[PDB]
Amino acid sequence: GRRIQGQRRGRGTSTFRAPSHRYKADLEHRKVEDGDVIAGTVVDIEHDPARSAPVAAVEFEDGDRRLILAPEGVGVGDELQVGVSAEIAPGNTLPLAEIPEGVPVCNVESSPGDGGKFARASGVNAQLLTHDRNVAVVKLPSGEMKRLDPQCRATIGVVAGGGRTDKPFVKAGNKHHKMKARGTKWPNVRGVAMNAVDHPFGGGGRQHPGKPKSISRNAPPGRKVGDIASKRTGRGG
Amino acid sequence: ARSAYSYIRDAWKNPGDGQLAELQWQRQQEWRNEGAVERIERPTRLDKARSQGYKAKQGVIVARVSVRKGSARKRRHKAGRRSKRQGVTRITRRKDIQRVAEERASRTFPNLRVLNSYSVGQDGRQKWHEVILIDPNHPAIQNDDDLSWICADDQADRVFRGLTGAGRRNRGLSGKGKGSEKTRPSLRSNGGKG
Amino acid sequence: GKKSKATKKRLAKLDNQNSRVPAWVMLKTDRRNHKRRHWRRNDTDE
Amino acid sequence: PVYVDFDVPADLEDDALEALEVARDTGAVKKGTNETTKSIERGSAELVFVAEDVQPEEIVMHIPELADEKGVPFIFVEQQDDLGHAAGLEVGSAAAAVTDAGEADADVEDIADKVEELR
RNA sequence: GCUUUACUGCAGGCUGUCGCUGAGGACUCUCACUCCGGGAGGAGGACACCGAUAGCCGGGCA
RNA sequence: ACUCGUACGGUCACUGAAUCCUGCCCAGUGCAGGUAUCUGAACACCUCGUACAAGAGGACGAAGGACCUGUCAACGGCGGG
RNA sequence: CGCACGGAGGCGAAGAACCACAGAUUUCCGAAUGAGAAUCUCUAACAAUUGCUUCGCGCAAUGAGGAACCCCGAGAACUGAAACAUCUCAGUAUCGGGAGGAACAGAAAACGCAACGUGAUGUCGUUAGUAACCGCGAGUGAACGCGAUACAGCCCAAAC
Ligand SMILES: [Cl-]
Ligand SMILES: [Cl-]
Ligand SMILES: [Cl-]
Ligand SMILES: [K+]
Ligand SMILES: [Mg+2]
Ligand SMILES: [Mg+2]
Ligand SMILES: [Mg+2]
Ligand SMILES: [Mg+2]
Ligand SMILES: [Mg+2]
Ligand SMILES: [Mg+2]
Ligand SMILES: [Mg+2]
Ligand SMILES: [Mg+2]
Ligand SMILES: [Mg+2]
Ligand SMILES: [Mg+2]
Ligand SMILES: [Mg+2]
Ligand SMILES: [Mg+2]
Ligand SMILES: [Mg+2]
Ligand SMILES: [Mg+2]
Ligand SMILES: [Mg+2]
Ligand SMILES: [Mg+2]
Ligand SMILES: [Mg+2]
Ligand SMILES: [Mg+2]
Ligand SMILES: [Mg+2]
Ligand SMILES: [Mg+2]
Ligand code: NA
Ligand code: NA
Ligand code: NA
Ligand code: NA
Ligand code: NA
Ligand code: NA
Ligand code: NA
Ligand code: NA
Ligand code: NA
Ligand code: NA
Ligand code: NA
Ligand SMILES: [Sr+2]
Ligand SMILES: [Sr+2]
Ligand SMILES: [Sr+2]
Ligand SMILES: [Sr+2]
Ligand SMILES: [Sr+2]
Ligand SMILES: [Sr+2]
Ligand SMILES: [Sr+2]
Ligand SMILES: [Sr+2]
Ligand SMILES: [Sr+2]
Ligand SMILES: [Sr+2]
Secondary structure, X not given: OOOOHHHHHOOOOXXXXXXXXXXXXXXXXXXXXXXXXXXXXXXXXXXXXXXXXXXXXXXXXXXXXXXXXXXXXXOOOOEEEEOOOOOXXXXXXXXXXXXXXXXXXXXXXXXXXXXXXXXOOOOOOEEEEEOOOOOEEEEOOOOOEEEEOOOOEEEEOOEOOOOHHHOOOOOHHHHHHHHOOOOOOOOOOOHHHOOOOOOOOOOOOOOOOOOXXXXXXXXXXXXXXXXXXXOOOOOOO | OOOOHHHHHHHOOOOOOHHHHHHHHHHHHHXXXXXXXXXXXXXXXXXXXXXXXXXXXXXXXXXXXXXXXXXXXXXXXXXXXXXHHOOOOOOOOOOOHHHHHHHHHHHHOOOOEEEEEEEEEEXXXXXXXXXXXEOOOOHHHHOOOOOHHHHOHHHOOOOOOOOOHHHHHHOOOOOOOOOOOOOOOOOOOXXXXX | OOOOHXXXXXXXXXXXXXXXXXXXXXXHOOOOOOOOOOOOOOOOOO | OOOOOOOOOHHHHHHHHHHXXXXXXXXXXXXOHHHHHHHHHHOOEEEEEEEOOOOOHHHOOXXXXXXXXOOOXXXXXXXXXXXXXXXXXXXXXXXXXXXXXXXXXXXXXXXXXXHHOOO
């Protein structure tokens, strides 16, 4: 047959690539040595084309104009502090050890000094729970208990732009516009609507899948379609 | 009496034992951070170098080359192939890793000619060989009664035509009698059956 | 279209080649330009 | 480094190289690793010198173990070119040997005794 | 051309084993090696990666 | 590549606005979890054999399978008397 | 005073034409090398990679071409087997790299008419469709020796 759509994806052609040249900033945490004497004023609130949520333009004490991942309730004029001895206020970045338990946090690092990996999408947050000399247990937006190094930096507050998922797209045109700003080929043609040559579920006199949809983990690319290694399917039971 | 050289030789008989075990554990850390072809002032195995033809003279160059371990880096067939020709994993190249090393070195030094080479060990992912190269245009070599043969026009690109010792061994030319029917005078004259 | 200096020299040569075999060559050889190119009917390079 | 099991002080090294300079103008010395090795094997070596900046280490590697089973004393010099100049060469030397000292036999005996105290 | 519980094979995934690979039937360590950190240094660690081989799945492909 | 992205994400599929709804079935097939016991390759190890080797056998036993469980908005099924 | 027999004119006994050898000139692009470019352009150039080195491109090297031949790598399928998978087509077609006027080979850790024998290597004739391989099917297929051709043997590493 012919390579399926998921295989054409990896080749990284124009149709599948993100419009990186139209993107603003790689929202990472600032590099401080030790001292905390790094603070800044918020100059503007901009729209980030990569995440459909707002991003705050901050100017630091040493004269560095950088775009930071904006939490909720951060405006122009507000002072934000980045460092170890930083104030426990919304919009400030300090390591998980210094942040008190039961406080909603965002833009959490995986390995200390990476710049933030977890809890970055609109309105989400990570919950800091347990403290130790060795480990800081953070509850990620999926409900998972992630055991992290207490030296991993994070910004206090929930991410801005909450409730985005609440309003429906209503029409295909609105989806079109959102998708033109992402690294995704859209619209989606069902495999069941294709020819046998194009997809494992293609073919037939009527539209139905060939074999069952739940595919093994060990399945090769070109066959791994439908429900990938499903523990279960359906709603009931 | 024994030469000092015989001790470098006896150490290299077991590169995983003694002082050499510790030496190679240290050296390979620096080698893994080095390039594909690294020119070195002095050979790691002086005995083997001198035995192969090296001289501490002008126009005599040595270079360490790292080539990857394992079989062929083969692409699977994109057209119709019978079961016998459908393999990828078990296919190995006909040229040995030492010969790949000699060729890579000769390309890094277009003006020089490969004299010989030898192994200087391996780790889990790559192998290292030091290649002795010679400048055919330097008068220090054009006047050397032991090395001036390499200056002849017919010795140009000798490695790419399999004229090296590693070349001749890999071509199956070692045996002068039984077993070398399809190898001598060349693999090509014998219809590529060697 | 915009032509370069070299393109202009080439087009110029093609125009010069488009001339007839002079009257005197017909008398010298005692009795035809095979490279007769028209702007519409034929096609040049580039 | 791998063949070096003890560090020799800058003062002891100064004494050693000075004793080598008067060993060539009075007695007799062997210059180069091959000639040093043969001296230890033949027994003619009174005191053997070895450089610490030898790359590759294989050239010199055998001297500390060969001298131990032949009773010949050895000392470490930091630099290769200093040992070569002390032997009377324009170039450097990885190893040198004193084949019967001259008017330095008292100094050589003391250097051999100072090295044993330093293990 | 296409399909599959047709025949035979080939990729790919999973898994054991050997090499890299080290110190004191479960365990500690750090020195290779990997990753994070601009750096200092931090996480991991003889595992993982990679090379080799073995069993299973394997119309994804021939 | 996705990705100047991080679960309010994005990948893989099905259905196809709204409204009222979406029953029963896990035996087969698929996927997934578990598993006393059974089965389960090579290396190393033990026995036999060979002054060595080929080779025969044993012990151990991974994933997988048997076996058990979950799952149908998973492939599908919803009859005869 | 070319092919090319015209018109005009001219050159040649100051020995032209014509031929042989050697030399002069030899635009631009082209390996194309200062940088760029569809044969042009912009502001001193071995670009790039190397060896030597006065460590300065100072002295050198490589690159690209050539009818096929040659050497080193990568390596099909139609086809044949009256299907077809091993086998066959075939190490063929084709592809990558490279030398020369020829390449490659080459002075035995050989042979093994087992010998009280031969004596570097190619090649030619033969050995022979023999030995050997093979769904032991179809097919595949040497060598030693012999008769010839031409002949030529040497240098390091180490010991000291
Ligand atoms: Cl979306
Ligand atoms: Cl060469
Ligand atoms: Cl004979
Ligand atoms: K075939
Ligand atoms: Mg970022
Ligand atoms: Mg949705
Ligand atoms: Mg797009
Ligand atoms: Mg659709
Ligand atoms: Mg259709
Ligand atoms: Mg149709
Ligand atoms: Mg298909
Ligand atoms: Mg339908
Ligand atoms: Mg349907
Ligand atoms: Mg030939
Ligand atoms: Mg005109
Ligand atoms: Mg990295
Ligand atoms: Mg098929
Ligand atoms: Mg429809
Ligand atoms: Mg140019
Ligand atoms: Mg066929
Ligand atoms: Mg046939
Ligand atoms: Mg038949
Ligand atoms: Mg054949
Ligand atoms: Mg024979
Ligand atoms: Na070369
Ligand atoms: Na063969
Ligand atoms: Na035209
Ligand atoms: Na067709
Ligand atoms: Na069922
Ligand atoms: Na000319
Ligand atoms: Na040049
Ligand atoms: Na220069
Ligand atoms: Na047929
Ligand atoms: Na057929
Ligand atoms: Na066969
Ligand atoms: Sr970074
Ligand atoms: Sr990042
Ligand atoms: Sr279908
Ligand atoms: Sr239900
Ligand atoms: Sr060349
Ligand atoms: Sr026209
Ligand atoms: Sr020196
Ligand atoms: Sr509806
Ligand atoms: Sr079931
Ligand atoms: Sr002869």
